[PDB]
Amino acid sequence: VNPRAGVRVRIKVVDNLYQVYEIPPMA
Amino acid sequence: DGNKRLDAVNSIVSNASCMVSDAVSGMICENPGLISPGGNCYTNRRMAACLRDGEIILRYVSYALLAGDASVLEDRCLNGLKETYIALGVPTNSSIRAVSIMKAQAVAFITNTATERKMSFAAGDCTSLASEVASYFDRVGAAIS
Ligand SMILES: *C(=C)C1=C(C)[C@@H](Cc2[nH]c(/C=C3N=C(/C=C4\NC(=O)[C@H](C)[C@H]4[C@@H](*)C)C(C)=C\3CCC(=O)O)c(CCC(=O)O)c2C)NC1=O
Ligand SMILES: *[C@@H](C)[C@H]1/C(=C/C2=NC(=C\c3[nH]c(C[C@H]4NC(=O)C(C=C)=C4C)c(C)c3CCC(=O)O)/C(CCC(=O)O)=C2C)NC(=O)[C@@H]1C
Ligand SMILES: *[C@H](C)[C@H]1/C(=C/C2=NC(=C\c3[nH]c(C[C@H]4NC(=O)C(C=C)=C4C)c(C)c3CCC(=O)O)/C(CCC(=O)O)=C2C)NC(=O)[C@@H]1C
């Protein structure tokens, strides 16, 4: 909806361990 | 193949500023009437709005690539845009040129074939991803033509 927003994605590696991928909010 | 997709997205977002300014500058140098009085990039307010729209479109296209589906782009960015541009007097043919230049840039970064900047990847092939991101950019023109 708002394109200026950031983005956060959660990847499961194992139970209770995650890889976090970020796109920052726009300047 | 998910690691390749993450690399491909990173290659775009890491160069997103240069992509937008170079595409909108390219649209202008090909059609300098856009900068003359009465042109739709004339005045700083207009040039800033155009640069903003370049960035928005690229932002949506990068989501679509990160998701492997066009819906976010079509629903949140492309829906309504043609009508808006008509109502505003934003030239859709010049818009499509800006988008086509960003398409050429993204294909280059994804396949690591940019002339002015190399990035770091394990050897392999990303042609599917480059063809996919192209199809997202082509949806923009399709929506606003
Ligand atoms: C006006 C005189 C005018 C331009 C401005 C320019 C616009 C233009 N740019 C391309 C192709 C690319 N631009 C790229 C952008 C970048 N490369 C970098 O290393 C930095 C980070 C960033 C911004 C400067 C890239 C990667 C490309 C792809 C080709 C390449 O790597 O050299 C085109 C070609 C568009 C097409 O193929 O349709 C155009 C028109 N050109 C001008 O005439
Ligand atoms: C086209 C995009 C490229 C290309 C990409 C390849 N990447 C490959 C492996 C790889 N890439 C990453 C980084 C990615 N994963 C992440 O979790 C994050 C951020 C959170 C990113 C940016 C990883 C971790 C890996 C796995 C290998 C490694 O651990 O070093 C790869 C090899 C195949 C594969 O793993 O699928 C390719 C081909 N390669 C190219 O030559 C073009 C230009
Ligand atoms: C640049 C490559 C173009 C160009 C673009 C202009 N856009 C102008 C205004 C504008 N754009 C949008 C759509 C944009 N807003 C969004 O929220 C989203 C997606 C969610 C998008 C794509 C809107 C709603 C507006 C109006 C509000 C505003 O001004 O931001 C604009 C200003 C027009 C005017 O008022 O004079 C321009 C110049 N112009 C060009 O010549 C090239 C082709």
Author numbering:
A (entry chain A): 268 to 294
B (entry chain B): 33 to 177
Sentences from the paper on this structure:
Red algae utilise a megadalton-size light harvesting antenna called the red algal phycobilisome (PBS)—comprised of rod structures formed from stacked, hexameric protein-pigment rings emanating from a protein core that is poised above an integral membrane photosystem. Published cryo-EM maps for two red algal phycobilisomes contain clusters of unmodelled density homologous to the cryptophyte-αβ protomer. We modelled these densities, identifying a new family of scaffolding proteins related to red algal phycobilisome linker proteins that possess multiple copies of a cryptophyte-α-like domain. These domains bind to, and stabilise, a conserved hydrophobic surface on phycoerythrin β, which is the same binding site for its primary partner in the red algal phycobilisome, phycoerythrin α.
16 of these apparently ‘lone’ PE β subunits (with no PE α partners) are conserved between the two red algal PBS structures (which equates to 8 pairs of PE β subunits in each as both red algal PBS has two-fold symmetry). Of these conserved ‘lone’ PE β subunits, three pairs are bound to other red algal PBS proteins. The 6 non-CALM bound ‘lone’ PE β subunits also appear to have found ways to cope with this patch, either through truncation or by co-opting alternative binding partners. LR2, “Linker 3”, LR3 and LR6 retain C-terminal domains with some similarity to Pfam01383.
